[PDB]
């Protein structure tokens, strides 16, 4: 990738997106990150969409195979072997993202700092979903630590209805509920986030309105699910 110009890597990521070629899109964006310049908001969207499509597919596959494995155990080595194969690939992609975050992206403005720390939290959370034992404990701690640092910055530097702040809080609430066995904290965080966001919604710019309302609806829906 490093023999292509940065502008060409960005252009090819956009083409790969149009073609629904998300592995290629992610590789192009990794190449662009490695040029050593900061990413714009548009470019962070390209990076995020690409890697989440890739890991999203792996997560879905892992969940199917893990379900079959557990049902079977409840007919031979094949399901375990193949679940392990998919698991290893998923861990590889998560490691790549976490590597880029540590080596290049996490350092600038509040928006970008919060975005990248949120991303670190998310990819440790995806590692936690497949982890066992002592490794799982360390991974959970890493996710919590990334999310908490992001929350601290966002509370000091961003308005309560900012869509990045909202998406971070939504994902941290999911961490609490699904990973950390903390339903009380999940519900308390989501409810506080929703109420504080609605209280300041009148100050939010129109360019963020569709995004922030989408996230607030998801906070509401989870709260209904959890209570």
């Amino acid at each position: 990738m490093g023999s292509m110009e940065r502008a060409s890597l960005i252009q090819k990521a956009k083409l790969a997106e149009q073609a629904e070629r998300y592995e290629d899109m992610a590789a192009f964006m990794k190449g662009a990150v490695e040029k050593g310049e900061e990413l714009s908001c548009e470019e962070r969207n390209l990076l995020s969409v690409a890697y989440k499509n890739v890991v999203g597919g792996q997560r879905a596959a892992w969940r199917v195979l893990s379900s079959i494995e557990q049902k079977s155990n409840e007919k031979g080595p094949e399901v375990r072997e193949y679940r392990e194969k998919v698991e290893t690939e998923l861990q590889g992609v998560c490691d790549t993202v976490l590597g880029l975050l540590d080596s290049h992206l996490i350092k600038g403005d509040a928006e970008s700092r919060v975005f990248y720390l949120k991303m670190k939290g998310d990819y440790y959370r995806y590692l936690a979903e497949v982890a066992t034992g002592d490794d799982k404990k360390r991974i959970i701690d890493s996710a919590r630590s990334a999310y908490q640092e992001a929350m601290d910055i966002s509370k000091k530097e961003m308005p309560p209805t900012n869509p990045i702040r909202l998406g971070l809080a939504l994902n941290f609430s999911v961490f609490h509920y699904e990973i950390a066995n903390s339903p009380e904290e999940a519900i308390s965080l989501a409810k506080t986030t929703f109420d504080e966001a609605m209280a300041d919604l009148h100050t939010l710019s129109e360019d963020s309105y569709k995004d922030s309302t989408l996230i607030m609806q998801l906070l509401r829906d989870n709260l209904t699910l959890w209570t």
Binding site: V49, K52, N171, L214, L218, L225
Partner: peptide, 12 residues
């Protein structure tokens, strides 16, 4: 059980 929903994979 239905899993909790996280931030959707869309352009913000």
């Amino acid at each position: 059980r239905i899993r909790s929903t996280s931030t959707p994979n869309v352009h913000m």
